[PDB]
């Protein structure tokens, strides 16, 4: 079935209603052009950051203004720019369509769908460089945004309005962490509550198109495209699109934030946006500084990340949680752009290659990873079961030099060593398998409550899984109490402990022995 006569009728109504009032346009002329930059003489009334239209539907942005010409960044199809063409003035700064029609779509850094699934019904438009919420428009970050990852949710909690940097060399699991954070919001979405639903935006800067396809496939297999938009500026796009993609993704998701909704935006490799902006600025011949960066690159990133806010109840109570991603080189967190984005954000998750190879996955360095919001972004249950975790892990890391001399250690030292080994095995997690908060609470209760001291360290993972499986099948009421009350009462703790005892007497280790005390 195809509506061909409807296709007649559409263009019929279009051409029968076509009109172009001959209004006075202000035009300029291209004088030079190269490497994606075009200089345009004329256009006296053009303003900074204004969109210009070249012949052939080509777009540009007027960045440099001086008495001679206008240096503009071409947003694609640059090989069609020639000396002598005419450039029209649009009269508008960069705007992007915004609305709920963007949920499930893959779009340009201009609001144009590149997935092929048809045009996007847009509610309104929104300027790219609108100011961030005031210092009196915000509100303390208090609601947790559950990433579903035990290491993050327990050690470096993320709130609704926080900006957490996922920083790591490469192939350490940053994209995996962010995709798991997106997938974990599926149950929040199925609740239908606009106070619990989180809309996700994923900005892919400078990525191979097949990587964006793989990310979208992972999000679809987890049912996460019902609430996720993907703003893709692939590796083949102009430096203009790679520079504008995070601002397009953040212009969207502010239409939602100001409507009283909660959004999570991921900026995959802000480093690549920085390199695109550096290319643009070096082609426009702006003065370079450290590592040839333009000198307003810290501004480039802070202007973007200061829009992830937690609005007041007088403004609706919406929020935008930012997850920027930075690729260091050889773990050089003291580089320029890593320094900038570490200085900007509220906390950092440092993923490492050495930890990744040791089987610690997600490879988060819980020693240097920090969250300046802290326990204010945790439910009471997770806040109390994970307080007994940081000190234990630090003691384990300072005792692991004596891992081979437990005979010469005090009883408390050896107990701390074994508890720390079990805890390190507890924070491991498969990829694309996020856990709801009550299951993480039960797992960390296993870890910190001493209920893993009877299990061989090479079995802990399995044990944990199996126990949760048991509790998902037999005793659902415990998880329901933790989920609805956000706390683990004493009665629930007793019930959970006796369930653990029964399961332990039913559990079979891999060494053959029983795990009963």
């Amino acid at each position: 079935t195809i509506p061909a006569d409807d296709i007649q009728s559409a263009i019929e109504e279009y051409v029968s209603s076509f009109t172009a009032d001959t209004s006075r346009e202000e035009v300029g002329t291209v004088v030079d052009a190269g490497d994606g930059i075009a200089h345009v003489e004329g256009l006296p009334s053009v303003m900074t950051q204004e969109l210009l239209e070249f012949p052939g539907g080509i777009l540009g942005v007027a960045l440099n203004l001086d008495e001679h010409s206008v240096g503009a960044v071409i947003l694609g199809d640059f090989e069609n720019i020639e000396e002598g063409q005419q450039v029209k003035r649009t009269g508008e700064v960069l705007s992007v369509p915004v609305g709920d029609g963007f949920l499930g779509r893959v779009v340009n850094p201009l609001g144009q769908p590149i997935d092929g699934r048809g045009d996007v019904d847009s509610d309104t438009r929104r300027a790219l460089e609108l100011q961030a919420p005031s210092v009196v428009h915000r509100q303390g970050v208090k609601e947790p945004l559950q990433t579903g990852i035990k290491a993050i949710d327990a050690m470096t909690p993320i709130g609704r309005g926080q900006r957490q940097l996922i920083i790591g060399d490469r192939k350490t699991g940053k994209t995996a962490v962010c995709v798991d954070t997106i997938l974990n919001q599926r149950q929040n979405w199925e609740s239908g509550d606009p106070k619990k639903q989180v809309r996700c935006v994923y900005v892919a800067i400078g990525q191979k198109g097949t990587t964006i396809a793989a990310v979208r496939r992972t999000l679809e297999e987890g049912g996460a495209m019902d609430y996720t938009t993907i703003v893709a500026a692939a590796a083949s796009e102009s430096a203009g699109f790679k520079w504008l993609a995070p601002y397009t993704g953040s212009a969207i998701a502010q239409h939602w934030m100001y409507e009283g909704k909660h959004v999570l935006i991921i900026f995959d490799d802000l480093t690549k946006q920085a390199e695109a902006y550096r290319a643009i600025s070096l082609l426009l011949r702006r003065p370079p500084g450290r590592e040839a960066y333009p000198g307003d690159v810290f501004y480039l990133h802070s202007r973007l990340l200061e829009r992830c806010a937690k609005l007041s109840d007088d403004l609706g109570g919406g929020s935008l949680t930012g997850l920027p991603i930075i690729e260091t080189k050889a773990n050089d967190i003291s580089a320029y752009i890593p320094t900038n984005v570490i200085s900007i954000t509220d906390g950092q998750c440092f993923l490492e290659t050495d930890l990744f190879n040791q089987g610690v996955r997600p490879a988060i360095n819980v020693g240097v990873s920090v969250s300046r919001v802290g326990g204010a972004a945790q439910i009471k249950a997770m806040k109390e079961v994970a307080g007994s975790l940081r000190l234990d892990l630090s003691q384990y890391r300072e005792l692991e030099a004596f891992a081979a001399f437990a005979s010469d250690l005090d009883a408390a030292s050896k107990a701390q060593l074994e508890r720390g080994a079990r805890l390190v095995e507890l924070l491991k997690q498969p990829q694309s398998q996020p856990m709801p908060v009550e299951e993480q609470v039960v797992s960390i209760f296993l870890g910190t409550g001493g209920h893993l001291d009877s299990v061989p360290v090479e079995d802990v993972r399995r044990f944990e899984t199996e126990l949760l499986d048991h509790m998902r099948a037999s005793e659902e009421e415990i998880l329901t109490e933790i989920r609805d009350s956000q706390k683990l009462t004493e009665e629930a703790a007793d019930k959970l402990t006796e369930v653990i005892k029964n399961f332990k007497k039913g559990f079979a280790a891999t060494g053959g022995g029983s795990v009963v005390p």
Binding site: M47, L65, A127, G289, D296
Partner: protein, 469 residues
């Protein structure tokens, strides 16, 4: 007739052409208008260079998105001026003097230019003086200098904001003074957080907040410290009041200066900072000084890039710092408030020529005992306290008692416990720690030393625990 017009717009850098006899002086404040209704605003420009041919190069303080060539530029005739007076207390301002919580407030105050000169050499104090805050650990091991600069090395979760409120309370109630908070490159979330905490503890009425935020061009981040310093200089010189100026991350002031230098086309120095790094740091830090009986004492948060204390920015900053306070997490976990690390903190006036001989002797004795305890802590942790010697066990108990008596019931905790804050005179602190080091409190349990004032509070807390003498 006498106004200029925009000629070039290159990001935050704007060139403005004026008539032949109306060129604005350097550092003047100019006003341009962005009329595009979405981004409509009034740009404030600061004249940075005279390029010749009546052209001036200015750094914009708001984003220039939407500026058109030819727009009229108005010259104000003076530098960036901030409102000064007693009415700036309890409010939040930006680097230009605009009230953020109550727009329009302060516009009819006296206005002072943020570019001023330090006191003349005739007026500077030739003798250093100790600022007695009332805190035991500070007054003993890290004595502050009145009219000096104190580095603060506390991260998150070690009570840096609590110590800030404590210092506000002490400077307002022990000296009859004022506090000014300059958030240089302030995270807007943390800025709003600090605002609501200062409003909840009822210490906002004794503070003026000046926020140059992170989402702003480098100009305001470079000038917010000067704005707050101008408010503090009015409180000192004109009101006759002791002032406490909290500069949060002076490193962001240095970094904003470096960015502004890069934008203006200036060739970078070593590492990458501006060629005039030391001159700008001096132009800022030399106005924080004691003068004519009144002073401005400054506490500055310092960032050290790559933990490299020889990096040009911290190496230039530390040329002006008189003390150092390091807030430790190992001390905050023990329940010791303030969480001042007694071994990582340091002062330059901890000298017999300044504090005296008994003060210096007691401080060195406490530091020796604490260093020995920290040496023994690893043997205690891995192998156990039981393995130690008996002289070592005695020293460990005495050192635990000293380390716990370094804590204090702060005036910033009164809102949570109701107990009024303590102000231990430096003589009483010296006597108490001398008697601790001697051993006069080796029998008293440890919990009798947590969060108390001088010696009478210690004796009473002990007697309320069935232990006397």
């Amino acid at each position: 007739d006498t106004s200029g017009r925009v000629v070039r717009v290159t990001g935050p850098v704007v060139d403005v052409e004026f008539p032949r006899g109306s060129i604005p002086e350097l550092f003047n404040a100019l006003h341009a208008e962005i009329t595009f209704e979405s981004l409509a605003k009034t740009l404030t420009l600061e004249v940075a260079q005279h390029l010749g041919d009546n052209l001036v190069r200015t750094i914009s303080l708001q984003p220039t998105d939407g500026l058109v060539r030819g727009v009229e530029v108005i010259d104000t005739g003076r530098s960036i001026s901030v409102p000064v007076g007693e009415g700036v207390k309890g409010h939040v301002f930006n680097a230009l003097g605009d009230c953020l919580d109550e727009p329009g407030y302060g516009e009819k105050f006296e206005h002072w230019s943020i570019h001023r000169k330090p006191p003349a050499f005739e007026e500077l104090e030739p003798r250093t003086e100790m600022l007695e805050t009332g805190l035991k650990v500070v007054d003993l091991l890290t004595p502050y200098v009145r009219g000096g600069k104190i580095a603060l090395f506390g991260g998150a979760g070690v009570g840096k904001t609590v110590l800030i409120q404590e210092m506000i309370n002490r400077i307002a109630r022990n000296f009859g003074g004022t506090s000014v908070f300059a958030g240089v490159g302030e995270r807007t979330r943390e800025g709003n957080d600090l605002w609501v905490e200062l409003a909840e503890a009822n210490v906002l009425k004794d503070t003026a907040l000046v926020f140059g935020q992170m989402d702003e061009p480098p100009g305001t981040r470079m000038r917010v410290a000067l704005s707050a310093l101008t408010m503090a200089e009015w409180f000192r010189d004109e009101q006759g009041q002791d002032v406490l100026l909290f500069i949060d991350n002076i490193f962001r002031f240095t970094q904003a200066g470096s960015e502004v230098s890069t934008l203006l086309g200036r060739m970078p120095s070593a590492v990458g900072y501006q060629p005039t790094l030391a001159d700008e740091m001096g132009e800022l830090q030399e106005r924080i000084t004691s003068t004519r009986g009144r002073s401005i004492t400054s506490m500055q948060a310092v960032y050290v890039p790559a933990d490299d204390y020889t990096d040009p920015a911290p190496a230039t900053t530390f040329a002006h710092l008189d003390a150092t306070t390091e807030l430790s997490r190992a001390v905050f976990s023990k329940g010791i408030f303030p969480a001042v690390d007694p071994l990582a903190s340091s002062s330059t006036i901890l000298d017999p020529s300044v504090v005296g001989d008994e003060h210096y002797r007691v401080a060195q004795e406490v530091i020796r005992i604490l260093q020995r305890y920290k040496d023994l802590q690893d043997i205690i942790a891995i192998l156990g306290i039981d393995e130690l010697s008996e002289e070592d066990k005695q020293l460990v108990n005495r050192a635990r008692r000293i380390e716990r008596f370094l804590s204090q019931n702060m005036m910033a905790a009164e809102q949570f416990t109701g107990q009024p804050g303590s102000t231990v005179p430096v003589k009483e602190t010296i006597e108490a720690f001398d008697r601790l080091c001697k051993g006069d409190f080796d029998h008293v349990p440890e919990q009798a030393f947590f969060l108390i004032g001088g010696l009478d509070d210690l004796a009473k807390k002990a007697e309320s625990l069935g232990a006397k003498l």
